[model samples]
Target chain A: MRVLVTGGSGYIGSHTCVQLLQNGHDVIILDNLCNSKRSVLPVIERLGGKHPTFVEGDIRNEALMTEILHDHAIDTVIHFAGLKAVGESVQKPLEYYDNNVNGTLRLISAMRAANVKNFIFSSAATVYGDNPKIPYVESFPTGTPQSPFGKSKLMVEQILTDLQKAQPDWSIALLRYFNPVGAHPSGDMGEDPQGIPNNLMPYIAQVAVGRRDSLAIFGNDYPTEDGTGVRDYIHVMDLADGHVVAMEKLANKPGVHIYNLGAGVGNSVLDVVNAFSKACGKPVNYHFAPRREGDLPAYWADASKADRELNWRVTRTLDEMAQDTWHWQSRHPQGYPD
Target chain B: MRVLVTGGSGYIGSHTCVQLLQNGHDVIILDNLCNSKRSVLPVIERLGGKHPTFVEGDIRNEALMTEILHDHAIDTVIHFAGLKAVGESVQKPLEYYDNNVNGTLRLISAMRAANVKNFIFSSAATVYGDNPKIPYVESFPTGTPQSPFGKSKLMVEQILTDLQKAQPDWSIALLRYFNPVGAHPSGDMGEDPQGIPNNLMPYIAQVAVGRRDSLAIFGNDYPTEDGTGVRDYIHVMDLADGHVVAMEKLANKPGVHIYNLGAGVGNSVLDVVNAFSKACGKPVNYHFAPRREGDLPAYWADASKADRELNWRVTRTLDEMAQDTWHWQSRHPQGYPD
Candidate 1:
């Protein structure tokens, strides 16, 4: 399928581009490079053995999106563009809403105009908000999300679902991604977020590379095995592969399908620190801190639905995630050049 | 207080403008006139004995809104600008989201830029969805709204609440209105819905005024007093007054507050028909039809919270609502001049 990957130069998006190329899908990348780098474009091409037609623009540009859709004759849209930081979202809620919720609406509107029905949205497990359970299921009631970022994703999920009901011809896949980490096996492409990173692996990788001092673990008093918060950390490549499979599943299907993409297992903060220590072949120092206000104690994904339906599952371990992340950090210590 | 009323040319907005002016508040209307008429300005001025400054522009125009806010030194915003048709919203979800949700975001963003924090949003009982209950309290869990129109309102409500938490200095009020019917008692202004009217009262009024043929009541098989769907119908003037009281409550307050503005009484479809018949001094013909999709069987507002907090209540009766609606319809049989 000819695909339009919104935010196609970003971390998971760049990795997905490799998979999309390997799977023989023609790709067109639409990226504003607001948070990601343009240098990642060449890395994506080099790793994938093919270059996607990259457009320097934003999804919020409706006219541009519509033009790109029809001009490229795009069939499937892998929507990966959004503002993802929870803390920052609280401080700047309007900016987040504009970039995430409003951006998706404009993208979808343009898609409808161009008669492109197949869409894959980059959702998050944050919509599940702090449930006191081991593995969160897709059927779990989506309570009011705790943060502006989560609320934005949940709102998009709802809008898409409602849109599908209105236009039954549109095929939409709401992929609820858990924590995605790691890099490509070649160590050339990986998660390269701008500024002080928000996620765990990148922060740990930065520390291991001696760019940052040490990781400040949010809490060590949570009701977990090691008294720390637990999350399902899926390797980035595995997440990228999940996208390919989701696209394939929706190729002939015409309905709104939601699936949880994760490792289907929980890993505590200590577990990650220990794994990173091994991957670095040195001690990755970390210190305990007070519990963050909105941090969840524990939550993983009951990703059996994705495995059963999309015929996909996480293929990498926590060790692999750490090793690949470290490898990328070691090669490009300051991340991709601007 | 000097006020900015977005969508101040529409049904509830035009009525609210009169009330705002009569309350001795300086008023400025910022409207696109997309779904309303420019003729409403004269009606509002005539009824209130004062003319408001009207800007013919959209709320989504950030520069315009910012300019308006600074130029007028607006302190409060009575936001009524939005796409209101539920049926049309389903068919054109993107238009609804862009117009209602994005427009409000831009309006609020402009307000923030200008440091204007007092905002009164025009929400609806549709945010309650199909809650099978009498007198829905302000605290009812807002479920997934059935249509794009309702969902947009709920999303804005969620966004506004989050915004208030992020910026504690902002005083925000989410006024969830029930059915707003009737008009000014002087018979100069009423709902001038373009094309086919969506609401019950306006369509009925159009029929009574010889513009439309007969009214097709949705269903009569509902489990209600008269086997027809029951609703909380508050007179438009009462709703407008609710806004004035809400503004007063928020004047000295700086926190997120929510209120349900309604008559706090459910009236059956047959009751409304009977009232209109008496007011018009002629029978309004109607026929029972199949239940419309997504139409709630019954709902009202438990508006004691608004009464307790804002010291406001609906002083008008059902008879008065019918009489006022007839007064407007009888005076302007062809509606406002184009």
Candidate 2:
């Protein structure tokens, strides 16, 4: 199988490209380096032991994408190209819409023109909005999203669903991702955030590397056992493997599918910090502040469908996630291959 | 006041331009004739009896729009652009999104750059989604929209709301419109659908003109009295006047506001056919078919907000709507200056 992967230099895309090569598939990497770096390629090549074609350009360049897809005989499209920050989206909604919403529009349009229909979208748990419901299933309502970034993902997922409904020949997978943590086992091609990280894991890594003093915990007065918000964080490698499984299922099957790609169990912020302290051989510093207004007390995913359907589940423990993250941070000190 | 109106040659827009000119405001029309005809300019000029500036361009052109906004010293923008076909929207969702969604992004971006903060967005009753409990109020949740067209409008409305939230000084009026029907009393500018008309009024007119055989009244088994899908069919002229009131309120006030521009009453498809018979003195052949998938049973607006807030209400009767349609259909048989 041959695939055109957008945002292939980013965290999940890089990981997925590695697994794609391992699973006997040819890969083409496209990244703008707006949020990612070229440093991820060597690690991917190291893991897969093969080199894939790389294209550095915007997905909005439809002509270029069409040429690539047709010339390379691309069969599947693993679309991970999008802006992911929720707070930045609120302030700069147009930028979010232009990049995420319009970028997918161009990519899908190019794929349609080239007669390539298999797509795997990297959706987010933010589609759930502020719903208090825990262990959200794939069947959740997914009403109006709060921020533009969330809406950008939700709108694309909706568009993909509509496209599949309108044309059943298109095979699409809507993977609603929860938090993804940890680096590759080799401590190469890890999570290398550019600005202040939005997610907890990267921020924790920064704190552990002594680049940051302590994590200012957003909320601490929740009704949970730890009096902090809870979330499901998956190992990045497991997430990568899940993408491979999705590609295989879609290639074998002939319909649109959705899956909750998350660890089923929920872990509180304090729980993760404690686990990190044990794994990293240091007392991870953290202090609680006022709760982030929209932060939920606790939520995870009912990911039984992935188990039954995709034959996928997370094998990495919390200790493993913390250890691997610290290992990458301890060696590199700074992120990226540089 | 100098005003800029996008899609000013279309059904309701031409009428609004007439009122704006009559109300002693300088008007500049920017239209891209995707739905309307260029011939509407002569008809509008003859009606206004005053020549207004015209630009044959799309609102999506950012530089052109910014130049127009600044050069014309336009104080207010009445945006009536974009596609409207519901069934076609599902099949060609991208087209609708590009024209309606991206066009709006360009328009708003241009406005922001030009320091033009006053805007009137042509939203739709479909923003309310399904038929509400009674006459739909402005406070109804803008849940999942029926078609890509409606979704595009709701998304714009949301974007405007967020924009106004961010910049409190900006004046944005989201006019949630019910079904707009009929035409100008002069019969010069009327609703001229290219192919089959989507709404009941124009479909009936086409049937009367012997262009089509009979009307397909979608969904006869609805819960309404006639069970032919009741909608609030306000005369387009009165709806145009409603725009005047909306702009007046926003110009005088400093905050964002929403008003339902509708005839505060529900009329089934049969009700419209009978009304047309009375006014046109011609029988409109019709048959009730299965309801269109997303058609509502009965949905009108409690347009009291427009009455109290904007000091606007539909003063025209159903007889006026049918009579104007007959006038336009009988005179031009086609639409516009032709």
Candidate 3:
């Protein structure tokens, strides 16, 4: 199948692109490189053993996307292009909405014009929001996402749901991703955030590689096994593979399909720190701070649906996530060169 | 305050413009005229005794909105520009999202750029979704809106809420209108829906004036008093007045304020038809059809909050609404000339 991958040079996207290419599918990578890099293009080619066609542009560019879809004769789109930072989204809600929500609207519009209906959206567990219930199921009512970033994701999902309902022939997947962390095993292509990393895995990786000083854990007073917040962290490779499987599922399925792409196991902040320390062969430094506002105490995924339907499974464990992340971070302490 | 009213030439917007002008506020109307007419400009000017500066452009054009905001020295913006057709929205979700959700984002972005912090958004009680409860208060948890059109309004309200939270200095109002019917007391201006009207009042008016065949009232077996859907129908003039009051409230208020602008009384479909028949001095020909896909059974507004906070009151009655609607429809059966 010929596919168009928006934001195909970023961490999760590039990994997914590699899997798409390795799976013998023709690939076109359209990325603006806003928070990503162009250097990942060659890395993707090297890893996948095939050079996917690259277009450095934004998903918000409807005309360009339409042109790309028509020119490549694309049949499906794996949309990963969006603003993902929760704190930054809170600071700039308009930008988040414009980039994520509006951007997706433009891309979908372009796809509609081009008649490319199959879509696999990079949704997040954030759409589950701050639900107090543990192990969120697909059937659970989507709570109100706390921040603009999360809200943007949920908004797009709702829009796509409506779109699919209206146009029954449209095959779409809402991949509700849990915390995706880690890098490609080769260590050459990895998570290379532009600024101070926001996620725990990247921050921990940076600290282990001596790029950052130490991690400032948000809180450790929650009623968890450890007093810290617990999250479902999926290895990026496993998460990427889930996308490949989802795209395949879209082939016969002709409705909106949603799946929880996660390890389905909760890992506390201390669990990650300890795992990373073992992976990097050193003590990962960290200090507790006051609890951040809007941080959920705990939530994992009921991944049984994805496992059964999509024939997908979490192949990599938390140790593998830490090891892969450490491998990439230590290999390129300063991250990918511009 | 000097104001910029997006979609200012449309029904409720034009009424609001007259009130704004009569209240000594300078008005600049930026409308694409996609669903409106150029003829309404003269009527607005004549009604208010002040000519507003008009720019024929869409709110989706960020650069244009920014230019209009700066050039007009616009301190406040009353955004009523959006697609409002629920059924059409389902068929064409992208157009709805782009025109409504994305359009407002562009307007707000331009406002942020120009430091125009005061905003009065045209929201809807459809944001309440199909709640089993009636008399929807501002405090009700916003249910998932059924259509793309309704969803767009709720999405904008959520966006504004986040924006106001991020920037406390910004004054914003989400006036959730129940159902705006009727028109200006004078016969010169009123709703001029481009095609077959999707709304009940306009459709009935059109039918009464022989523009349409007959009103196909959807469903007669609802559990309302008249076995028909009951909606809180607010007169357009009164709804417009609520906007003026909301704008005034924004002056001292520095955060997001929400209010329900309605008559706070549910009028059944038969009730409206009977009222219109009396106002027009002729029977409104109608027939019952199967229940529409998403039509709610009954709902009104808990308008006490608006009354207490904004000192707003519903001055127009059902008979007044009917009379005014007939006055406009009878005079302009063909609507505004292009």
Q: Give the TM-score of candidate 2.
A: 0.96
Alpha-carbon deviation at B186 in model 1, angstroms: 0.6
**Who is ahead in lDDT, 1 or 2?**
1
Two-chain DockQ for each candidate model: 0.72, 0.51, 0.88
The candidate maximizing DockQ is 3
**Two-chain complex of model 3, DockQ on C-alpha atoms against the true structure:** 0.88
All candidates: TM-score: 0.96, 0.96, 0.97
TM-score of the second chain for every model: 0.98, 0.97, 0.98
Residue A173 error, candidate 2, Å: 0.7
Ten-residue stretch with the least lDDT total in model 1 chain A: A126-135
Question: Mind giving the per-residue lDDT tens digits that candidate 1 earns over A120-236?
Answer: 999989888767765989989776678899999998998898788888888999999999999998898888877899888888888888888989999888888899989999999
- Itemize residue pairs with steric clashes in candidate 3: none
Candidate 3: where is the Cα deviation over 4 Å?
none
- Identify the CAPRI category of the predicted complex in candidate 2: medium
Candidate number with greatest lDDT: 3
Off by over 4 Å in 1: B210-214
Q: Write the per-residue lDDT of candidate 3 for residues A52-121, one digit (tens) a residue.
A: 9999998999999999999999989999998988899999898899999999999999988999889999
**Candidate 1 local lDDT, residue B61:** 88
